[PDB]
């Protein structure tokens, strides 16, 4: 079975370089080219270039030729892509894919899982977990929505639950966004007005990279 295992996620400071891997198995490495594809949330897919592992021949997209270098290791059936002079524009998911010939054309028949690159000077940082209660002036209804703001953490991921899983319905945990080199996300939970604040409601956010496990309680605000 053809397979392409790519290297793990990367966190690198701008202006530095990075070299990610793409190990091939289940086929003759030297008999097929290796292409590299870049994906950023809001563009689609870009073809960086390809390499012929047999002879090491490389063809680059002129957009990426200046900062990109493709190489292979025929002894381990592994292709490498080096990115130099990194900027935030190079934060993306990078795929490798095998190309096959047909009717003079080439097409990508097997892809790797993708390698995430995040260009940032940030270091591992636990989130600040802020409780979101309704405004004191607010008059709630039969259903009351409660929130929890998870702000200033690095890197992904974070795990958020409510009452340690005992509140499953009406939960919306949103994807993270990037502020100044740091991540922020939020989460909502909706419960009957008979449940809160007569009972406790707690968001539990876990951040494995920092070994953090924060439980934050949602209490009614103080008036005035």
């Amino acid at each position: 079975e053809v397979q392409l295992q790519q290297s793990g996620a990367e966190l690198v400071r701008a202006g530095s370089s990075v070299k990610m891997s793409c190990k091939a198995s289940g086929y003759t490495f030297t008999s097929y080219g290796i292409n590299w594809v870049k994906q950023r949330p809001g563009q689609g897919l870009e073809w960086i270039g390809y390499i012929n592992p047999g002879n090491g021949y490389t063809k680059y997209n002129e957009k990426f030729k200046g900062k990109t270098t493709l190489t292979v290791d025929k002894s381990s059936s592994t292709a490498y892509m080096q990115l130099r002079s990194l900027t935030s524009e190079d934060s993306a998911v990078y795929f490798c894919a095998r190309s096959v010939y047909y009717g003079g054309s080439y097409y990508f028949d097997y892809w790797g899982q993708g390698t995430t690159l995040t260009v940032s000077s940030a270091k591992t940082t636990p989130p600040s977990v802020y409780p979101l209660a309704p405004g004191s002036a607010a008059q709630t209804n039969s259903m009351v929505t409660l929130g929890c703001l998870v702000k200033g953490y690095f890197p992904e991921p974070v795990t958020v639950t409510w009452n340690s899983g005992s509140l499953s319905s009406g939960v919306h945990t949103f994807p993270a966004v990037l502020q100044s080199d740091l991540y922020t996300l939020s989460s909502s939970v909706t419960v009957p007005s008979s449940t809160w604040p007569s009972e406790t409601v707690t968001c539990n956010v876990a951040h494995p990279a920092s070994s953090t496990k924060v439980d934050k309680k949602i209490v009614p605000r103080d008036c005035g």
């Binding site: 897919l45 795929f95 097409y107 949103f174 605000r221």
Partner: protein, 214 residues
């Protein structure tokens, strides 16, 4: 170089429908067109190459056609596992180029968002920051505009938005909007407003609070 355009970046369809995803090339690519399927988990799979040839292991309900500049991917009797993003790609000239992609979604009845606004937390304020949060939950379709106002006039700096994927159970979408300020700036103003505009009504849904009423 050759530009590949997919005029529809989001496409609605029901299970069992006949879905057609289009793709236009900036010049004749001589049937050198391939189709790829990317799932939400990021994984990518080849479906069709050279316009119409089915890649091994791909169900027969995936069909491809086209010539010259216009091509299309047709998926008969759509199934749940077919809900994904589809990219076309020309292999006629270098550099290889992809289309922007087309993410399918499940049709359902329109639903207005439920809007909730939240002032900054006491904890955060003692840190010198102030974030105002607004949830817009369980709405369909996914197009929606959120607008923030401070003391009655629109604000856009510091606003960061986040959208969920279509819910797997009720097929609705949800959105979070957060307006971040300094403690000092937040305390110089009074009314903070979250306005949601959605096709379910001509009038926005307005949620707001006043600092002087806290």
């Amino acid at each position: 170089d050759i530009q590949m355009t997919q005029t529809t970046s989001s496409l609605s369809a029901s299970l069992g429908d006949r879905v057609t995803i289009s793709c236009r090339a900036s010049q004749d690519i001589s049937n050198y067109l391939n189709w790829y399927q990317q799932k939400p988990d990021g994984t990518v799979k080849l479906l069709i190459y050279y316009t119409s040839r089915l890649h091994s292991g791909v169900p027969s309900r995936f069909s491809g056609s086209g010539s010259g500049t216009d091509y299309s991917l047709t998926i008969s009797n759509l199934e749940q596992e077919d809900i994904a993003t589809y990219f076309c790609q020309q292999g006629n000239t270098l550099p290889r180029t992809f289309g922007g992609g087309t993410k399918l979604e499940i049709k359902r009845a329109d639903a207005a968002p439920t809007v909730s606004i939240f002032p900054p937390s006491s904890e955060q304020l003692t840190s010198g920051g102030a974030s105002v949060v607004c949830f817009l939950n369980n709405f369909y379709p996914k197009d929606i505009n959120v607008k923030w106002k401070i003391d009655g006039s629109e604000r856009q700096n510091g606003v960061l938005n986040s959208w969920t994927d279509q819910d797997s159970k009720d097929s609705t979408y949800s959105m979070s909007s957060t307006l971040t300020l300094t403690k000092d700036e937040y305390e110089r103003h009074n009314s903070y407003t979250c306005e949601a505009t959605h096709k379910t009504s001509t009038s926005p849904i307005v949620k707001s609070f006043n600092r002087n009423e806290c």
